[PDB]
Amino acid sequence: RFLRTVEWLGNMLPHPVTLFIIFIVLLLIASAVGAYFGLSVPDPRPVGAKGRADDGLIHVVSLLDADGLIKILTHTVKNFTGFAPLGTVLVSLLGVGIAEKSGLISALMRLLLTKSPRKLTTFMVVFTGILSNTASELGYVVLIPLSAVIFHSLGRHPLAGLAAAFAGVSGGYSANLFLGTIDPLLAGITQQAAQIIHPDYVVGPEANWFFMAASTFVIALIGYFVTEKIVEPQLGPYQSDLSQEEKDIRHSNEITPLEYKGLIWAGVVFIALSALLAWSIVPADGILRHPETGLVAGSPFLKSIVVFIFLLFALPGIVYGRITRSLRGEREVVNAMAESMSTLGLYLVIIFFAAQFVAFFNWTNIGQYIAVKGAVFLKEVGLAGSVLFIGFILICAFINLMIGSASAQWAVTAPIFVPMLMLAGYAPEVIQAAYRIGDSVTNIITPMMSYFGLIMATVMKYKKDAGVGTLISMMLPYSAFFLIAWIALFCIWVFVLGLPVGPGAP
């Protein structure tokens, strides 16, 4: 009855939008009650020569109809529009759509399992599973039942190959090399949630490139224990009677000389773009730096690295698409962008209510109150660089089983966590990295994602199991060997190295 508890976890509390509704509903009466009779919090820590004032007392502010109603009504489209994630995600996704549906990303992951050696593919299947998070679908449909099929011909066993790439896709979610559509997405919410105390901070789209790139190999190497974790539970059936028609038909999805001729001719335009972006930033006589200073930090470059990942995705895809005739018309690629832009349906609502939640939070000053009261807590017991950040990863990997689903979680918790752990002596870029560990690790063990469906359609293609929900108990050690494998990699980024760490000058 550990399954039942995990199922109760996700099916307990209402929608994350409904959360934001009750949040900004209760916060209204929170401000109303708390600031009706009398309340105050004595001290912050804004030490400096003016600017950030010396004054200690920052009070909760009610819903006094006069200024309150005017503020909510005037700032609604204003909150939404200026909401940090909003424009940044869309601009980036605009380019992602083309790369994905041009069959560029499709054939890119379709050719590696063909090119990689046997001993390598055993670990490459998982390693590739990690990098398929930028496409948000490829990893499930044409990689999961393909990983399982590649293990009958080029591998050992399918029911541990379905799992080989499912640990990579679901588990190695946030970990990826090039900035995904999550990097400027999560950097956005982390940004607009960190402006409750230091209202000028900007979480770049580059955020955790160093961490997440170095974290691809580390978890891919615990994908080498899949050779130790295939035999340990059990083994069984041998080819033949295991859905053979759909097995060896999964081979035409391998590659064609057209797909290769594109990859070789889309890589050309990719490396071209990549070289161009470097031109302007390299020299000290360079054109795109900070115009006054000359220091790369703070330059328009990092302010346009959302446009750059819109570029580095779109244009390689379009050249791949035209040259191999993947998609012809110039009215076709636009009718295709509209398709990808049609998928962010729920995203906007939770963004309208996150803007609204971080608004109702911010200008009622309750958000800063919660921030400092949690700051005095975590600097008490002696919670140093890795006590606070082990205690962090564990909570956002536990709440992830209830309401946690990428941004649905973060949009809720970031207004609660990030203003409070910033003051503790630990910068917010670091806690966005740590959260981008916690949401990805426990994805395997059931939240309430019903994407079991396609996965179950793969398990029945091989081992028709007696009990259903066997894959989750089977998958428990894979999310255990990943939890510890990642947390360890993070502490080498706090008591060892971290470029923007602490609210000081690291």
In the complex, least distance from residue 352 CB atom to a second copy, rounded to whole angstroms: 7
Give the binding range for a second copy (CB under 8 A) out of 130-138, 208-216, 250-258, 298-306: 298-306
Residue 179, CB-side half-sphere exposure with 13 Å CA sphere? 26
Does 156 sit near a second copy (CB under 8 A)? Answer: no
Q: Is 283 in the site for a second copy (CB under 8 A)?
A: no
Determine, following the binding rule CB under 8 A, whether residue 241 of this chain makes contact with a second copy: no
User: Near a second copy by CB under 8 A, which window of 24-32, 215-223, 229-237, 328-336?
Assistant: 328-336
Do the beta carbons of residue 141 and residue 148 sit within 8 Å? no
Q: Is residue 494 a contact partner of residue 423, using CB atoms and an 8 Å limit?
A: no
Cα gap 414→338, rounded to integer Å = 30
Q: Looking at 133-141, 171-179, 339-347, 441-449, which segment touches a second copy (CB under 8 A)?
A: 339-347
- The answer to whether 448 contacts a second copy (rule: CB under 8 A) is no
DSSP per-residue letters across 237-273: --STTSSHHHHHHTTTTS--HHHHHHHHHHHHHHHHH
Least distance in angstroms from the C-beta of 93 to a second copy: 9
Binding-site string for a second copy from residue 89 to residue 118, where x marks contact by CB under 8 A and - marks none: -xx--x------------------------
How many residues in the shown chain lie near a second copy by CB under 8 A?
A: 47
- Between residues 287 and 381, which has the closer beta carbon with respect to a second copy? 287
Please state the closest distance from residue 198 (CB atom) to a second copy, in A. Answer: 21
Interface with a second copy (CB under 8 A), residue from 153, 239, 256, 335: 335
Alpha-carbon distance 466 to 459, whole Å?
A: 12
49: left (phi over 0), alpha (psi -120 to 50) or beta: beta
Count CB-CB contacts under 10 A for residue 277: 16
CA distance 185 to 179: 10
274 touching a second copy, by CB under 8 A: no
Please give the residues from 65 up to 84 whose contact with a second copy meets the rule CB under 8 A.
65-66, 69-70, 73-74, 76-78, 80-82
Q: Which range in 37-45, 50-58, 107-115, 303-311 contacts a second copy by CB under 8 A?
A: 303-311
Among left, alpha and beta (phi > 0; psi -120 to 50; other), residue 466 is alpha
Report helix, strand or coil for 415: helix
Task: Say whether residue 243 binds a second copy (CB under 8 A).
Answer: no
Distance between CA atoms of residues 211 and 300, nearest Å: 23
Helix, strand, coil % over all residues of the chain, rounded to 5? 60, 0, 40
Site for a second copy in 9-28 (CB under 8 A): 14-15, 17-18
**Region from 126-134, 299-307, 314-322, 498-506 binding a second copy, contact rule CB under 8 A:** 299-307
Q: What is the 3-state secondary structure (H, E, C) of 208-223?
A: CHHHHHHHHHHHHHCC
Q: Which of 492, 375, 360 is nearest to 434 (CA)?
A: 492
Q: What 3-state class would DSSP assign to 41?
A: strand
- In the complex, minimum distance from the CB of residue 95 to a second copy, in angstroms, rounded to a whole number: 11
Binding residues for a second copy (CB under 8 A)? 14-15, 17-18, 65-66, 69-70, 73-74, 76-78, 80-82, 86-88, 90-91, 94, 287-288, 291, 300, 303-304, 306-307, 330-331, 334-335, 337-346, 348-349, 352
